[PDB]
């Protein structure tokens, strides 16, 4: 049986359209890879990436809850938040792995692996130490921001374009706070404040036909302000770190 | 006489810091033969989009409204905020006859 490939939605994402004031909300199910990292209970707190059928690309800082994985349960394929949609698929944390060299990312894998259906699909992972050139347009996603009347408990989007590093490490922008195993996607001089992504969410960037998951959302740091553009890990950098994991657990 | 919806909402120009000024009016909320007490995101913003056409000045220019931006709300007397439903439907209470508020903005762009 054929499967879906990574990172092509079957519903085209509305792709909100830049410096928009409170984003939008997405079409649903246009992220595909977008999840949902929750307690046993049921709570959320963190976001996620599916890269995988059994692997979910997230933030380390979100492991700091518990250390064992059966106290996490992963959400995939939803759009609103609490009502979860009937085919969503919720699937217990086997296993957990931190990135040694600079422990911003970690890797859980699934107790089982998540069905690939036309709405959970993960999303494409970039070639090794690929740096996304400047002014790269992107998109973070998440329930990172409780919206009105119209778009409470929905998955919201926001389009931020990439700021170079050395740009954004200037002194009146991040000043120096940003290393190279990091990106800057932003508005600098003006712009509007974009919190939607949930720490460990996505941060994803178009090329040709697929959507290239490009950055994770950094503890604490992703929200994209004026001046001060949100700070998402490098996904490039950790890919082969990433391909060893799975391949080794 | 009848519940009925006070909207005093803002534009604000897509991709852009700039608000616009709207005019804010009045809806009345009834049974069916003036909207029903369960709103249709479409139908509000349409409302609001006829409204616009219809006071433009010689200085505000035609814009069309496109959605409602994240920090509209629908609330009553008691501040309780409503949410819309899986079909941006906004279901409010039938009694008391009472009055409800929309406000916050709304995302519209230059019609050109």
């Not at chain 1, 519903?11 to 890879?33: F, I, L, Q, T």
């Not at chain 1, 380390?60 to 939803?78: D, Q, T, W």
């Not at chain 1, 690939?116 to 070639?127: N, Q």
């Not at chain 2, 309780?80 to 409010?92: H, I, P, R």
Request: charged share 20%; with cysteine; net charge neutral.
């Amino acid at each position: 049986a054929p499967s879906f490939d990574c990172g092509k939605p079957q519903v085209e994402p509305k792709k909100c359209p830049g410096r928009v004031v409170g984003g939008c909300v997405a079409h649903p199910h246009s992220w595909p890879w977008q999840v949902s990292l929750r307690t046993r209970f049921g709570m959320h707190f963190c976001g996620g990436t599916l890269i995988s059928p059994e692997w979910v690309l997230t933030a380390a800082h979100c492991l700091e809850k518990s250390p064992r994985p059966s106290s996490y349960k992963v959400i995939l394929g939803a759009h609103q938040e609490v009502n979860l949609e009937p085919h969503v698929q919720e699937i217990e944390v086997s296993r957990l792995f931190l990135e040694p060299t600079r422990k911003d990312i970690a890797l859980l894998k699934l107790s089982s692996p998540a069905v690939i259906t036309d709405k959970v699909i993960p999303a494409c992972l970039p070639s090794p130490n690929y740096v996304v050139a400047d002014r790269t347009e992107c998109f973070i996603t998440g329930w990172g921001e409780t919206q009105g009347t119209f778009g409470a408990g929905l998955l919201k989007e926001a389009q931020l374009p990439v700021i170079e590093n050395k740009v954004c490490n200037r002194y009146e922008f991040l000043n120096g706070r940003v290393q190279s195993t990091e990106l800057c996607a932003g508005h600098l001089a003006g712009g509007t404040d974009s919190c939607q992504g949930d720490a460990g969410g996505p941060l994803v960037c178009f090329e040709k036909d697929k959507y290239i998951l490009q950055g994770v959302t950094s503890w604490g740091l992703g929200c994209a302000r004026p001046n001060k553009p949100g700070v998402y890990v490098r996904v490039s950098r950790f890919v082969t770190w990433i391909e060893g994991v799975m391949r080794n657990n | 006489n009848n519940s009925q919806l006070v909207v005093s909402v803002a534009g604000t120009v897509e991709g852009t810091n700039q608000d616009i000024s709207l005019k804010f009016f009045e809806i009345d909320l009834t049974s069916r033969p003036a909207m029903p007490h369960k709103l249709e995101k479409a139908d509000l913003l349409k409302a609001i989009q006829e409204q616009l056409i219809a006071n433009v000045h010689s200085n505000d220019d035609y814009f069309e409204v496109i959605d409602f931006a994240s920090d509209a709300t629908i609330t009553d007397r008691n501040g309780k905020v409503y949410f819309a439903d899986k079909d941006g439907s906004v279901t409010l209470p039938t009694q008391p006859v009472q009055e409800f508020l929309l406000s916050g903005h709304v995302r519209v762009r230059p019609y050109k």
